[PDB]
Structure 1
Amino acid sequence: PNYALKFTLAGHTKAVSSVKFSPNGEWLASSSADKLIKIWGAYDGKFEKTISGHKLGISDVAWSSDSNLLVSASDDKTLKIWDVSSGKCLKTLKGHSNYVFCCNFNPQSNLIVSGSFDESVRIWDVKTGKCLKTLPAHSDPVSAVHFNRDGSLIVSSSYDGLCRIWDTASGQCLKTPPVSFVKFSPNGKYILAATLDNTLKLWDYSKGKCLKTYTGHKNEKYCIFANFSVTGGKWIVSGSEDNLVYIWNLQTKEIVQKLQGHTDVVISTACHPTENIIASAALENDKTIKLWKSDC
């Protein structure tokens, strides 16, 4: 690929924590330690609006399938569901007893999954705003939660060193250094897992076997988002503690590009759902989001 910097998105006043593209490709959402969500045009980086209400910093944000809703996870121990077009808080999800660190809608978007420093994973009904299930998932803070393609499985990761797969309907576990990030692949067959020993691994969760290992980035302290890029060449994309965006060939595991420009840890990256566009976001020496575009 030839990702090149097209726009820098300034406005957050503390570290950015997460960036996500809306499923319809129109919007980028960012969350920050400054307690704010900001919405940006996905193709031109144009600032659209600020969404406020959380009492403390926000760690994560995630879109509903129809791109109409956002859920945010906050240090104020709540999640908030937002109407993106109005900016209004629709529901506040209360139940966690410590910082909420990660969140996601299921593909149907009738459920939200959250992970918290309270070491639990919670499953929430979007329509009633009530907690359906509290999973005693881990023995250290939960670093990531992700639904598979039909919402039947949740993958979770933790500083306890474990990655677990949960049956959504029952909340029961199906399968078991800190594991700092996990997510299902777009076909739902693989799980990409980061560990705080500077290593990403692609797992066949059916076989429970590691198929690929990606290194060259720096990751020993922070939970850094990673992604499958599928709109063009099949890459793995991650931030890094050396302030760069790393792109690997998924099959050969070779580094194909390093994106330079940020001035602090690249804590989050995201991949546009239909175009060859990457968003990246950095910690508080930088506080900006960058939009990069590739011809393939």
Structure 2
Amino acid sequence: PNLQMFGHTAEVLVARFDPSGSYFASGGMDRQILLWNVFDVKNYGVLNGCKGAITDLQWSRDSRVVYCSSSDTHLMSWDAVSGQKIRKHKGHAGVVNALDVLKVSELLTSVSDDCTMKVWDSRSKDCIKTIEEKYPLTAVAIAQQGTQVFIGGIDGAIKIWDLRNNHCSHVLKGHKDIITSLAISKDGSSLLSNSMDNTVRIFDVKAQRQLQIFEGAIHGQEHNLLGVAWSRNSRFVGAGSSDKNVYVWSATGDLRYVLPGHEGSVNHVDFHPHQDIILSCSSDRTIFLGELN
């Protein structure tokens, strides 16, 4: 099958599976996160409260608590079993754009239009660290180790920071413009990155040079943050584009699947943790589950 489920009122942004592979969550401009099943593809809770639009979901690695990143500074927290509020992580003085989580579900990183990175504990309700750069930040990724945090800004310079040192250790180079989504592999050994130059580049974690520049997935005037993912094997790379197409790569530098279906710009493509399924979201208010037999 394919399954193009409808439900949201307005532009949807982010849609992700549990780490387990038993649910979706989705939510964009609706101010409504809508949970789903995978295997009778039905809705669940209408997580209501966020007074800004959602920009990023992420399941806790317990598969119970959910975290948002509203446009009104809040980062909310939700008990996916019951569906009640837990907290309002009040901090930033602007619009949050990305979130990331660890193994230990306890630490979270967010990224504002205040040019401020901030690490959060799920127990304090306050910031543990505050890394002020200069130009409004956009994408962030934290490693599996719980050590390296990658920041993506407007300079095209993916900076790398550790939790012990807090020094500008390294800076990725050769990306001319804008970053819309970082993504660390299931190894902890390589990033993915969507630039506004349409060069969906991979980078190294440890020597730190490029690997493979992919090219063929356009951003334009919309200025949405488009996403990228690593497949459960780390064989395939799934980048969406404003051309209504989900450009899946071969990770060897070869375009295999280029499946259309959406009527509007695509945002955050994902992969299921085990069985080969693709979550693809788009302003359109629609979502697909593209499979491979």
TM-score (norm 1): 0.92
8 Å Cα contact 2:232/2:272 also seen in 1: no
Report the Cα distance in structure 2 between the residues aligned to 1:35 and 1:139, rounded to whole angstroms: 29
Q: Check conservation: 1:155, 1:183, Cα contact below 8 A.
A: no
Question: What's the counterpart of residue 128 of structure 2?
Answer: 132
| Residue number in structure 1 paired with 2:241 | 240
Runs of 5+ consecutive residues of structure 2 not aligned to the other structure: 172-176
Cα deviations across residues 185-228 of structure 1 (Å, max 9, x unaligned)? 11111111211011111111322211101111112433211011
Q: Does 156-165 or 214-223 show the bigger shift?
A: 214-223
State the 4+ residue runs in structure 1 displaced beyond 3 angstroms: 169-173
Aligned equivalent of 1:223, options 225, 234, 237: 225
CA contact (8 A) 1:239 1:267 kept: yes
Report the alpha carbon displacement of residue 10 of structure 1 after superposing the two structures with TM: 1.2
The alpha-carbon distance between structure 1 residues 213 and 142, as it changes in their structure 2 partners (threshold 3 A), is same
Deviates more, 1:59-68 or 1:200-209: 200-209
Tell me how far apart the structure 2 counterparts of residues 64 and 279 of structure 1 sit (CA, whole Å). 19
Equivalent of 1:155 in 123, 147, 150: 150
Residues 191 and 78 of structure 1: is their aligned pair in 2 closer, same or farther, counting only changes over 3 Å?
same
Q: For each residue in 1:117-156, what CA deviation from the matched residue of structure 2 results, as whole angstroms up to 9, or x when unmatched? A: 11111100112222111111x3322221111112111111
Q: Give the secondary structure class of the aligned counterpart of 1:209.
A: coil
- Counterpart of 2:30 (choices 26, 34, 38) is 34
Contact 2:16 2:25 in 1 (8 A): yes
Tell which has more relative contact order, 1 or 2 (C-alpha 8 A, sep 6+): 1
Larger strand fraction of residues: 1
Q: Distance in 2 between matches of 1:143 and 1:294?
A: 32
Identify if the C-alpha distance between structure 1 residues 189 and 149 changes in structure 2 by more than 3 Å, giving closer, same or farther: same
Find out whether 1:213 has 2:252 as its counterpart.
Answer: no
Corresponding residue of 1:88: 84
3-state SS in 2 of match to 1:290: strand
Letter in 2 for 1:56: G
Question: In structure 2, how many angstroms separate the alpha carbons of the residues matched to 1:161 and 1:211?
Answer: 17
Aligned residue among 12, 16, 19 for 1:16:
12
**Matching of residue 144 in structure 1 with residue 145 in structure 2:** no
| Contact persistence 1:45–1:291 (CA under 8 A) | no
Cα distance between partner residues in 1 of 2:135 and 2:151: 12
Rounded Cα–Cα distance in structure 1 between residues aligned with 2:232 and 2:74: 33
Give the alignment's Cα RMSD to 1 decimal: 1.5
**Equivalent residue for 2:288?**
290
Q: What's the CA shift for 1:168?
A: 2.4
C-alpha distance in structure 2 between counterparts of 1:181 and 1:141, whole Å: 14
Partner of 2:119: 123
Query: Deviation per CA, 1:219-260, whole angstroms, max 9, x where unpaired?
Result: 2433211011134x8111011000111101001x11101121
Give 1:278's aligned residue: 278
| Deviation, structure 1 residue 44 | 4.9
Shift in Å, 1:30: 0.7
Please say if residues 141 and 160 of structure 1, whose CA atoms lie closer than 8 Å, have aligned partners that are also in contact.
Answer: no
Q: Which residue identity is paired with 1:204? A: D
- Name the CA distance, whole Å, in 2 between partners of 1:257 and 1:219: 19
Tell me the secondary structure at the aligned position of residue 264 of structure 2. Answer: coil
- Please list the CA deviations of residues 12-34 of structure 1 after superposition, one character each: whole Å capped at 9, or x if unmatched: 11111111111111111112111
Contact 2:121-2:128 within 8 A present in 1 as well: yes
CA distance in 1 between counterparts of 2:125 and 2:259 reads 40
CA contact (8 A) 1:140 1:158 kept: yes
Percentage of matched positions with identical amino acids: 29
- CA offset at residue 170 of structure 1? 4.7
Distance 1:171 1:126, change over 3 A: farther
Q: What secondary structure does 2:119 align onto?
A: strand
2:197 aligns with: 197
Distance in 1 of aligned mates of 2:285 and 2:134 = 31
Q: Match for 2:260: what amino acid?
A: Q
Change (3 A) 1:143 1:116: same
Q: 1:207 to 1:45 in 2, by over 3 A?
A: farther
How much has 1:108 moved relative to structure 2?
1.3
User: How many pairs align?
Assistant: 286
2:65 is the alignment partner of 1:63: no
Q: Answer whether contact 2:64 2:79 (CA < 8 A) is retained.
A: yes
